[PDB]
Design a protein around this ligand. Sequence first.
Ligand code: NA
Length: 129
Amino acid sequence: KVFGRCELAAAMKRHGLDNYRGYSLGNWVCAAKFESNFNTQATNRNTDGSTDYGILQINSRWWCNDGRTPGSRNLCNIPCSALLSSDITASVNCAKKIVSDGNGMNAWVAWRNRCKGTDVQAWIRGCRL
Ligand code: NA
């Protein structure tokens, strides 16, 4: 399913992402916009044989198991298909693990390129919660 901006803002907040690892909620909403266009089922194959999955485009190399990323880990202990669910609980859980591994949101290219050092507050502007 495809989220709207404030709809995603609430869903990420609900799931503990406001200010997690010190990333304001807007960073996360921003990230998803440019990672997945807010679509919970976005996948994007990488040349290294991994795939990015879901609203936050979590990668199979380290974070989720999709059973076809050679020599990979599953550090969020989830199948990559959990990250494609309309319910973003697993995606957010996993993203929290990613930013907690010392790479922070630099893990996500679209954050680095379209959110970091920007007015990410704009992505939550006018939202209830
Ligand atoms: Na994996």
